[PDB]
Design a protein around this ligand. Structure first.
Ligand SMILES: Oc1cccc(-c2ccccc2Cl)c1O
Ligand SMILES: Oc1cccc(-c2ccccc2Cl)c1O
Ligand SMILES: Oc1cccc(-c2ccccc2Cl)c1O
Ligand SMILES: Oc1cccc(-c2ccccc2Cl)c1O
Ligand SMILES: Oc1cccc(-c2ccccc2Cl)c1O
Ligand SMILES: Oc1cccc(-c2ccccc2Cl)c1O
Ligand SMILES: Oc1cccc(-c2ccccc2Cl)c1O
Ligand SMILES: Oc1cccc(-c2ccccc2Cl)c1O
Ligand SMILES: Oc1cccc(-c2ccccc2Cl)c1O
Ligand SMILES: Oc1cccc(-c2ccccc2Cl)c1O
Ligand SMILES: Oc1cccc(-c2ccccc2Cl)c1O
Ligand SMILES: Oc1cccc(-c2ccccc2Cl)c1O
Ligand SMILES: [Fe+2]
Ligand SMILES: [Fe+2]
Ligand SMILES: [Fe+2]
Ligand SMILES: [Fe+2]
Ligand SMILES: [Fe+2]
Ligand SMILES: [Fe+2]
Ligand SMILES: [Fe+2]
Ligand SMILES: [Fe+2]
Ligand SMILES: [Fe+2]
Ligand SMILES: [Fe+2]
Ligand SMILES: [Fe+2]
Ligand SMILES: [Fe+2]
Lengths: 287, 287, 287, 287, 287, 287
């Protein structure tokens, strides 16, 4: 079974702007440049985010991690049985991603996805943030989460749950307008409240935002100010109703947003699905 | 499987008296009025207790919570296979209860029951008790418990255990008189020692009492005095022999009682069924 | 499955001597006299040890506790399938033992055994030791343990493990003499290192000793002196090699011994079977 | 299933040198001499390492521990079904090893292996290190680990995983030279990150090294100096990238090395396989 | 002010017997031989007990530790003002004791005493007990205690309290016989309940016993057996009424006894003086 | 009274080499350049180490921190009463150091010293190490320590203790050669075992080394490798006998060394002065 979101790749028009944004604003660590693009780290892994030159300015691919070769084989079989076109990653791609083995395919609406096992650790190159950040929260919870924008949430939900195995945490009926309410589905694959969210938002991108979690409230507070200095804040500090994360949102150079948060609650086998009519307990004012 | 008791609805002759009793005496929070009646809260849920106008002055319905849609479907199948008439809650009822989906049916002796999933949370409307109460204990243990009065405890026990899946915690042979001893069965569906009790008591109501648990001994002590001021106490402070809860009992405006307690022990998979000849270790004197 | 040793009954020639020994020396609580004999307590249960008048001066019966009625039914079936003569305890016997249901049978060498569920708790009659004892250790670990003396340990081991479900903890090859070594088997049915031990000792009784565990080292130290005052000590203070319990042994009025200890280690699913050539790390000198 | 590495036997040309090295340098306890050779202890077990006279100067055999007789029988069946020649250890061998039962066989490349149950504990002969060592870490993690040198790691990996049941923790691609990279596989059978490692190293021995873990950093620091005084250090203090153990390596009298470490992290069912390009985060400089 | 008892020297007729007794029986560490006699350690200090050849077979001297040079000067002045003959330890004596500075004098009844500062630590020669002992308790509590036998306890008490600054912990009126009761005074100079005791016992030595405290009950239990094997035990295991130490007593080769214990309670500025009529809560039977 | 060592200034011939060494090797944070020279941080303070251009290549000045203005006035009076020439720092110097007030003077052998109060904090410019360092240990313990080299340790000791108020922790008689032993004095002014050490070493500098303490063993391990890559290590990893710090030593561009350590023990009012014959328990081999 999928254990977590392991990495993400972005294809952007301004690579230098993304490099500055990720390191100086968010605190990620520059981890070199390879055929996989410019690499960035947040922990012991060789890389978590890759930035490649591309006019799409959006998420180019996402990789989900399984525990071992057997787990990869099981997921491959499930995808094929579901009628999805699955391709074994060649040696060239595996080396590019720094993984031992992987398979590639696309979700119902075209997002290129990868499931891999045996990623590269680089403990001998100790993590050093590009900005003052006490640390990022990963471990068994993976990289963080992203919100997939789709035209048919029922179809997307069925794929991610029935085929990929994600489990529903809760639903938030997002008020878009007096006569517009759209359900946002939050799904987990480990203890992180959600690793993936699905919603039918009117955005011209594959995702609304990706999220990175830090270890202290100060990490979030300082980052907010670094981002605010350039007028990139899109939402003030607030705490979510479902995962109880304290965070803020900001614009990346591609328009797609990034959420930066701290202190979210986790889920367990005793969790029960619920619904909400608001995404925030307090704060998160649109600015 | 059923995870907990999620909500209760009462049909009463004096709605204003119940509103005052629940808020000023017990400390519940007024949560508005809808087609579901006057709503009251004790935690993050949109409502836990509803009060509607009705001459019955008794419990009108109770809702048990399952983890998700799959759990609701499984319970529906079990009930049908057992020969119980099950009805899918229509969109109108689901909206009234603020749940995502639910089924309705009645227990062997006419109590309307509902099993639902996906109830509404309102973290954005922080809980504020109507009286000085540090907090109510809910979470994975649900709302609390109620004691179902029936004419045939063996039949009721079989339904709640064999069909609904409740598990026996223990039995207390209640001395009613020199030649009258009635067994009271205490059942659990989660860590709470009991979410439901069953006994053949000579009462003209569906339940003898419902119980709410608070976070501190002082919450109980102060509440006792607020209730005692109006001469509504039915039992002095005491601690039960089975769940070890420290509580007192009082009369609601409908005659049906309410138990208000603190510090009960929980049960686990290592629990063994036992019997008792007394319901109280100390206190709980009838007054 | 059997969850623990729940009670023991002794048939003795000097009932008054046993009453004095259990209360004044060991600290048990006198719990009245019924058709079940004189009753003694060590915790919240109505009784753990019964003493009846009888010329045998030995263990008369032992009762093993199961979790519920279903567990009793399962054990009954296993015993019958194994060819053992099983008898349903009549209402008269159940009332005598204060249990809800029970079955009776004998082990391969004649020891009367009982398996029951739903024993009586008496929290309303708070435990008060007959001597200065901070408390006895029971709970999920039951009453303690006893060592069954048999002429064929292989046959006894097969019955208790294959039929009753006990699991082997370890073996101690007891040096009886230059040319005599006898294996003692220690078996568990819960976290207590052993609830039953089996050995082919040259003793004219069904058991060599029964053991009760207390909460503090002082409980053991004080008890040792109370017993030593009457010259009843059989072994000095020592700590066992297998369960690491610190204890001493003494003679009951029936010759059969009693072990009184503190601080034993428990076992879990990660436990591995081992062997020992000595029963004591230190102490336990024969006196 | 195999629960841990329980013991190791070495056949050496200089028995006196090994005795001095194990006791004075590493701190093991001399535990007598039997037909099993000179015995050495690190904990409550009668012995963990045996040294016999032999011109091979290498590991002579290794014993893996199972939980009980049933576990031994299961492993025997698995080995036979896999086509491996299995021999039941005779009474003479069992007594020599101090175990209750065992089976013998060889791995694909000739290493004599044994799987046993019921080893001997000697708590009555309290462990006393031969040098200043606060303690060795064993328990459920067993003796420690050793690295098996083989000519075909794929074949060895298949045997140890598919037949013996070991599980992969991670892989380290060891840089041997500009055009030489060899994968080292680290496998676990309990919480210890690895109990066995497999690699195709150009060494004329069955193993590159065996490892013993101690309780404090000082235990390692002091040992380093005792070994360094005789010029036997092969690697300076360092911390590994995979198990995060802080250790140093040194030469035994047989050339085969020994790793002495502290503070390694453990693995659980939530562990995911990863890869590394370096075996050390810091230190471990070849000297 | 005096901070603790730092060391003791014994003059014995059988030096080899004392060496064997201290190391093999009690677990002290042999620390070489100098002009100060044979040295023994129990912790990081270069030595705590010295054994010299002498026909007296008794305590030859005791050294009390002060915090620094200023503290030594203050004590010297207090002793002189009290009329005691004080001598500055010459360079030769300081080197012999391994201290920076010291003064010498005798108590009212001839016991040679020394007060010093700046003793030698030897952390680079890690403590290794001569027997299986997890550790000795020293630190701010010093070496342990000894009981000074005197013909006039009032005179001795006045000297140790008024001149040396010891403080009374409690008094035990020791029953020597039907018409003989002698008060034993227990005094502290730090957190240890007592570092010195004073009593008028009919013994031909300067002290009745000296005491060493260990870290675990097992340390005491194992030591008891090592001593008992040679028939040297003088008192069975017991716990004292005043300091609550669990210990046993044994004979040294000089007749003077040694107490070996564990788990004593400490004293603070909130301590109040009390009296006892017995020295033991349980145990400590004369054998 | 002096509360801690607050800052140090170095006058060096190669400012660029020092900048690279402090940031890339040790992990300090570049904090700008002012008339105070290039500034470096290790915590919330605006600066802890300053580097100015100067041919001396040695410590140029050190600043000790007092709690407030009253404390500065008290120290000024003590110095004057002792006959030391004290100068009030002018507004220009205070601004240069970023302090509220300070006085200047020299120790007996020419080292320029300063005592100040009210230094500048810059929490709004969160600390970001120049290398992978989890953190430096400062707080109430100040910057760390340095070892003052002098021709007459008795004279220096008298000044620092009698005039500045430092307190002796312990003494280590350093073996320089067969006929050369020099005492090193370690002094504290807060919980740090030593903030200053004094010794008569044959070095052409004011100090032998300064020391910085980090939060993890890995911080030290990684730093060791960064320094070793340039062949600057002077001592291997080891642990000191007196403060028990685990550290290594390396050469700065000025020849003067730097000690980088972790896990030292602290001192309290219960501390007693002792002596040692070795500075290291293990390691610290000269290379
Ligand atoms: O806040 C946002 C989240 C995701 C995508 C866009 C976006 C990006 C490019 C062009 C237009 C839009 Cl709305 C955006 O503004
Ligand atoms: O992590 C989250 C938890 C709850 C709600 C949102 C959210 C908020 C605004 C727009 C879209 C989303 Cl998915 C969110 O990003
Ligand atoms: O204590 C009680 C618990 C449950 C029901 C009633 C009741 C309510 C109305 C009329 C008569 C009775 Cl006994 C009651 O008095
Ligand atoms: O929570 C409880 C635990 C044990 C006993 C009772 C009780 C007490 C009196 C009458 C009816 C009942 Cl169910 C009870 O309400
Ligand atoms: O220590 C003992 C344990 C069990 C039984 C007897 C016993 C009891 C009665 C007669 C003879 C004997 Cl050996 C006994 O002495
Ligand atoms: O609880 C125990 C643990 C280990 C050994 C014995 C023991 C000791 C002496 C004789 C018989 C037995 Cl079972 C014992 O009673
Ligand atoms: O470091 C080593 C690890 C394992 C084996 C040998 C060895 C032993 C004997 C002869 C030659 C060699 Cl390379 C060795 O030197
Ligand atoms: O315990 C270990 C963890 C990671 C790597 C090695 C290692 C290091 C050098 C050579 C061979 C090996 Cl297996 C190792 O011994
Ligand atoms: O138990 C004892 C404690 C202290 C001293 C002696 C002793 C020693 C030598 C000769 C006579 C006696 Cl009583 C002793 O026997
Ligand atoms: O440490 C102790 C605490 C209390 C009492 C005694 C004691 C016991 C017997 C004889 C002499 C003494 Cl001082 C003792 O040694
Ligand atoms: O290790 C050292 C510590 C302090 C000073 C010097 C030093 C610096 C410059 C010239 C000569 C020397 Cl010995 C040095 O080498
Ligand atoms: O922090 C320390 C603790 C103990 C000893 C030394 C030391 C070691 C070598 C040379 C000079 C000194 Cl001050 C040291 O720097
Ligand atoms: Fe989000
Ligand atoms: Fe889940
Ligand atoms: Fe109740
Ligand atoms: Fe249950
Ligand atoms: Fe026993
Ligand atoms: Fe088991
Ligand atoms: Fe290793
Ligand atoms: Fe595993
Ligand atoms: Fe004593
Ligand atoms: Fe005191
Ligand atoms: Fe230093
Ligand atoms: Fe001090």
């Amino acid at each position: 079974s999928i254990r977590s979101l392991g990495y993400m790749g972005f294809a952007v028009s301004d690579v230098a702007a993304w490099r500055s944004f990720l390191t100086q604003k968010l605190g990620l660590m520059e981890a070199g440049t390879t055929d996989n693009g410019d690499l960035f780290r947040i922990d012991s892994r060789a890389w978590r985010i890759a930035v490649q030159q591309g006019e799409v300015d959006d998420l180019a691919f996402a990789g989900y991690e399984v525990a071992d070769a057997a787990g990869l084989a099981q997921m491959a079989d499930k995808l094929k049985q579901a009628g999805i076109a699955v391709t074994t990653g060649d040696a060239s791609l595996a080396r590019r991603r720094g993984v031992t083995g992987l398979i590639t395919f696309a979700d119902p609406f075209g997002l290129p996805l990868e499931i891999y096992y045996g990623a590269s650790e680089v403990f001998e190159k100790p993590f050093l943030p590009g900005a003052a950040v006490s640390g990022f929260l990963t471990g068994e919870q993976g990289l963080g989460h992203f919100v997939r924008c789709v035209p048919d949430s029922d179809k997307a939900l069925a794929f991610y749950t029935d085929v990929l195995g994600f489990q529903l945490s809760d639903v938030i009926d997002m008020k878009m307008g007096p006569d517009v309410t759209v359900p946002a589905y939050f799904l987990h694959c480990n203890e992180r409240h959600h690793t993936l969210a699905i919603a039918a938002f009117p955005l011209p991108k594959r995702i609304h935002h990706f999220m990175l979690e830090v270890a202290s409230l100060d990490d979030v507070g300082f980052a907010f100010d670094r981002v605010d200095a350039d007028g990139l804040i899109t939402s003030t500090l607030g705490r979510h109703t479902n995962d109880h994360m304290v965070s803020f949102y900001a614009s990346t150079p591609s328009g797609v947003e990034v959420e930066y948060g701290w202190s979210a609650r986790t889920v367990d086998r005793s969790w029960v699905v619920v619904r909400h009519d608001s995404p925030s307990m307090w704060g998160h004012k649109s600015v």
